[PDB]
């Protein structure tokens, strides 16, 4: 970070695979970079490096990840377009320009081997070269830093894509083109100001959709139609305006990750225990009063986040869960700790989060056993 140039001793290793050069002016890529052949990741932050023919030939076959964070258009080296075996790319910097839009990325076409492309470049609209390179992509990440992103039938043409992330694209409403991507398996739309997500009724067109991410939005209510997505295992809808949970949502018995923290929840439906594969529960910062009995049906509940909740008493069924690996209780108005929590074989002191002045309320035998299990 912030050196005069490339030291010549850094070529002393063969165990290197990630190189990160940031704010290091006028670094010329020597042929001596051949001293490390297994290197596959390279970070060039705020530095357009000058390259040599042996170095370019070496990089044309033995590089996989290139990170380009640029304060200027000229800070992007041109020669990076010549590489053929690249598979991970990252372009950070506001390349959006008037009447020369997405022209700095014209050499992206030759990256046939590419599978991963991440974009944090304040792109107001979807670039055409992105559509060109989406014929064979496996992961596309777009981050506009809250800028409104417009597609208008330009994202459905990436049939081979397997992961889609449109973070802070300010869509405010799901575009239909995403439903055309039948190969798409996991979708992330974090912080896009979503208020009505009934478009999930089209999600049945995705037969391998097992994870959905629509968190950090203004979603008021969860449509019951999400019960049609039985495949889902991880569902993320926390940081929203949800006060009630539809019962039909609990038709997806495959659900394993259910995080709904920072919401207006007050009751946990009796159907929450219908999901045997439920492994992670997170309702932190809510108004939950008590744990429903069915919530203990999931014996493999390996995570439990109950913090900042108004629970009055801890149910005694918690000891019936033996796969409990971690649970946080800090921030709750509990009179005393039930001893059943102490009978979990997988539980540890570090796994448990609770106030010491109440943690001492447990009998000394249970506390000593917990400390011993924490030690080794």
């Amino acid at each position: 970070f912030m050196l005069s140039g490339i030291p010549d001793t850094v070529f002393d290793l063969v165990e290197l695979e990630v190189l990160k050069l940031e704010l290091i002016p006028d670094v010329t890529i020597p042929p001596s970079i051949a001293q490390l052949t297994g290197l596959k990741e390279l970070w060039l932050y705020h530095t357009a490096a000058k390259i040599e023919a042996p170095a370019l030939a070496f990089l044309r076959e033995n590089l996989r990840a290139l990170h380009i964070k640029f304060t200027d258009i000229k800070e992007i080296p041109l020669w990076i377009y010549s590489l053929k075996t690249l598979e991970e790319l990252h372009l950070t910097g506001n390349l959006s320009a008037e009447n020369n839009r997405y022209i700095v990325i014209d050499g992206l076409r030759e990256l046939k081997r590419l599978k991963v492309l991440r974009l944090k470049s304040n792109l107001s609209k979807l670039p055409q070269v992105v559509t060109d390179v989406g014929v064979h992509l496996q992961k596309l990440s777009i981050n506009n830093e809250g800028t409104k992103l417009i597609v208008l039938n330009s994202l459905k043409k990436m049939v081979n894509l397997t992961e889609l992330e449109l973070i802070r694209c300010d869509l405010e409403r799901i575009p239909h083109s995403i439903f055309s991507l039948h190969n798409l398996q996991e979708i992330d739309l974090k912080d896009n100001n979503l208020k009505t997500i009934e478009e999930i009724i089209s999600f049945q067109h995705l037969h391998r959709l097992t994870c959905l991410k629509l968190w950090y939005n203004h979603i008021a209510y969860i449509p019951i139609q999400i019960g049609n997505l039985t495949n889902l295992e991880r569902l993320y809808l926390n940081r929203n305006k949800i006060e009630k949970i539809p019962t039909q949502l609990f038709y997806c018995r495959k659900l394993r990750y259910l995080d709904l923290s920072h919401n207006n929840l007050t009751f946990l439906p009796a159907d929450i225990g219908l999901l045997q594969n439920l492994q992670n529960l997170a309702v932190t910062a809510n108004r939950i009063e008590a744990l429903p009995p069915e919530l203990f049906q999931c014996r493999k509940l390996r995570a439990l986040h109950l913090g900042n909740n108004v629970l009055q008493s801890l149910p005694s069924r918690v000891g019936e869960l033996t796969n409990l690996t971690q649970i946080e209780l800090r921030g709750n108005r509990l009179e005393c700790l039930p001893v059943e929590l102490g009978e979990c074989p997988l539980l540890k002191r570090s796994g448990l989060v609770v106030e010491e002045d109440l943690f001492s309320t447990l009998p000394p035998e249970v506390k000593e056993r917990l400390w011993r299990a924490d030690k080794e």
Partner: nanobody, 114 residues
Framework: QVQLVESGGGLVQAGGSLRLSCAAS????????MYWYRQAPGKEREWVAA????????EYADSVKGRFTISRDNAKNTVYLQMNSLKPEDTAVYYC????????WGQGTQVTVS
Amino acid sequence: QVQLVESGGGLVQAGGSLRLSCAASGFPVGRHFMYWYRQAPGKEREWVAAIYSYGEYTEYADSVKGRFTISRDNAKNTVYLQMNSLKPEDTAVYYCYVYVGNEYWGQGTQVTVS
């Protein structure tokens, strides 16, 4: 005041067509997503079709996709569901469903296939 009423149910032969009309009063049908579900005896209620609020995008149950047709007329604030190529496997009572602040299930119409 949000009221969903179903009309057009009854008995119909296999391979025929039937019109199920869902009428709404309290809310406009132009800006609201509408849903049609069905329930058969010995089986929990099953979703059939859904219609959007923008773009006239319509989805249907894969078992009956292409067999039924859902449309809406905003002037009468109604949803028309035309069922074609009927078979005994879809003998069920069909309900109109919406969520406007709260859930709303319609009266429903039982269609039997002979």
